[PDB]
Amino acid sequence: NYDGDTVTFSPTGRLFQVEYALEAIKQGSVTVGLRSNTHAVLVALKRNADELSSYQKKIIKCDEHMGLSLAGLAPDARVLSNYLRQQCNYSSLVFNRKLAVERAGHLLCDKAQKNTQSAGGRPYGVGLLIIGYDKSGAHLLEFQPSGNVTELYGTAIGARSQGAKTYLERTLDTFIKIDGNPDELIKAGVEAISQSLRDESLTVDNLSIAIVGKDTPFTIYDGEAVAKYI
Template sequence: MFRNNYDNDSVTFSPQGRIFQVEYAAEAVKQGSVVVGLTSKTHAVLCAIKRNAEELSSYQKKLFAVDEHVGLAIAGLTSDARVLSNFMKQQCLSERLTYDRAMPLELLVSLIGDKAQLNTQHYGRRPYGVGLLVAGVDETGPHLFEFQPSGLTQEMLACAIGARSQMARTYLEKNLDQFAACGRDELIHHGLRALKETLVQDRELTLENTSVGVVGLKELGKKALEPFKVHDGPDVKDWINSVADEAEAETSAEGGEGEGEGGEGMQVDE
């Protein structure tokens, strides 16, 4: 795309004050498959749709464990995501070695934000073409953070990034008030429902293309940690089936209402 040579590097502003390299990186996030994150009082959940480049290839991994108390989901360039996830792992290991404690979530996300923003200040570098949802638990409870290629990081109650993510955001906004009181399985159920909203008509959630990551507290008010774990394949079967069964029930209920209305109309005509 021709931008009058204002997009050759990430340190040159256009006359309108835009950095096109950052915008291109954000576009890479929009082209990635969708990931959804949401939190309750006890758990943080990440749900992702995996893609395969062709029928003969395996599905691309979307969820990564960083430490026992934190994990992340990616949308965009996987190679850039691995650079950032490895950096986060190093920081967590350093924190445990130096201070014998888990890395504070807000500090960890701030560090990757600074690392990404640094690339927009030095000639010859480029922004990371990946967006992250970072879910974890600290002494105050579960948290969810969004990372953008510009270096912007912010805490979210629920979030979706990637292709067709606006449909998932709409579902999350409608049901946001319910999340705080949800248990682990119910929160996962909401995440998969939001994920399902983003699918085109001929696709469904399957064991091969769906991943779920969960971290949380075993009991509200207790500090017993439920470590971050990625669930793939048979582990997500029951959750996917429950979402499918609910969708079928809603469809049949709508059909029943339509028949009832038709029946009433016939009685009035008689």
């Protein structure tokens, strides 16, 4: 009887509408993030509705030094990454200052929070992995629609995320040291994403990759350009 709206606590102090929004993530195709000290990588397995369909785009560029991957409601990733584009843009125009990744984190948390507290609205239903290279190096972030954000060396979200999160949890000391070596960080990313596959062997359409770093602007790789990583 307590899951009507977000403006309502349960007797045990839970917010069910938020918990249910969190659930939409677990239906999202798996995505992985990880970083050394000189780069950060996103690997996102894209999901297809049919064999005739696109494996829908899961990586959105936010600035020349920042970007994200989504798992859950794509429309919600679009609302939030758009807000992130504006916020990164504002930082440039007004202050001539590239936006700190942490600062992006706090901003997303706050945007998500409002939606957990007012009647008529609804929590966002998408989890996001955020990578960037700023004035303090490489950064990876995990956003939950509850408004919780965490900074990590690596992680995964979406269906069966636990596999890759386990692989990375052990490979920690191996990848954190892939400084100055780009291709070997993407490898480690791809090697992590497969520990959560089951469906198949990841193909040339299955895969989406994004890298940002010391002298590398945020770029998305799709298809022919990712073939050398399978």
